[PDB]
Design a binder for this molecule. Sequence first.
Ligand SMILES: C=CC1=C(C)c2cc3[nH]c(cc4nc(cc5[nH]c(cc1n2)c(C)c5C=C)C(C)=C4CCC(=O)O)c(CCC(=O)O)c3C
Ligand code: FES
Length: 359
Amino acid sequence: RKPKTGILMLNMGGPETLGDVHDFLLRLFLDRDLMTLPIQNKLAPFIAKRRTPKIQEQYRRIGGGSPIKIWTSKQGEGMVKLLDELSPNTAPHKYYIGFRYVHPLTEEAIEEMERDGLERAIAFTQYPQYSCSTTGSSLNAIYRYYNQVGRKPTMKWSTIDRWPTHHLLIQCFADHILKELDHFPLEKRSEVVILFSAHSLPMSVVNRGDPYPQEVSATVQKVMERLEYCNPYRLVWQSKVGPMPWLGPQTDESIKGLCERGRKNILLVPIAFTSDHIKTLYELDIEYSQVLAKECGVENIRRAESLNGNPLFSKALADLVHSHIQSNELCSKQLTLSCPLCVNPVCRETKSFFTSQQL
Ligand SMILES: C=CC1=C(C)c2cc3[nH]c(cc4nc(cc5[nH]c(cc1n2)c(C)c5C=C)C(C)=C4CCC(=O)O)c(CCC(=O)O)c3C
Ligand code: FES
């Protein structure tokens, strides 16, 4: 039975092997939509070459590469199973992986979708909170794909561009957070500080009106309401790259800072991610939870498990898609509004790309 509804899952993607690091980094630092750099066409290759060695080592420390592909697949397949049941009219569904900087690229996925003769195409972002740097860049890629070849899509497009407070997403983090608290020494539980660690963004992106920080902050609130404020918490930011200013406080300074101030029991939460990858398995689990923790003398620092294979997360993706279809909306209302200080000509086009679809 021919596939009827295609769900394109969008994310950054990561290198599968050490041999894939360099090209991954080149594509990444060349992407003006992610972040701007002077003479980016020439600076990117320089950055890529210089950075490749230490990143390769980091990947070797966590198994030899990023597992983002396998988790995205496990989540997609689970979503499809529930969709075929939840929405019979939308015939069989099929998910497509659209990574921004590694195979399968966003462009390759779209081609396969067109090749499949689908009727419906849904750009489903895997970034729950929207940033023009993440979901925005991935969507711009879909627009430019058709714009370059200069042909109209052979399928109906629509997009779920964000879902920062979806109740099942909130329940997963809350569930994962409770299971972690249960593992601190009992007499230290009520003292544990919950640090929600979202990926940071350069202030050059934040100060243009990026929706990201506010949406992340929204995810944090919901989760803490569900936990009914059982513990104190803070929203900190990880993974800053380069010397320019980024949104702080940084997760590392925060962990170090709490530890030197009497708060030696910390629970980390990768609130802006959907699966394990370098940002969690290496940065949070090794760099901070092993090295930094040991040097500052932390008594207990743990991290809530990533959404990964949680059945409930799969239920969340399917429910979002089903509701999306039932609604007939082409995109969120927020997508119809670009950054007040947006200076990217493509944004206007991408926006129109989804708001233009008939049916
Ligand atoms: C806009 C500024 C950003 C820059 C400059 C950025 C840079 C990177 N992001 C990477 C990987 C990644 N970044 C990722 C999600 C995000 N990355 C984000 C924003 C940025 N990410 C945001 C926001 C994300 C979602 C909350 C993911 C998913 C990986 C994949 C790595 C892996 O192991 O799969 C890597 C490769 C790792 C390294 O340390 O060399 C870089 C350099
Ligand atoms: S950079 Fe945000 S809408 Fe263009």
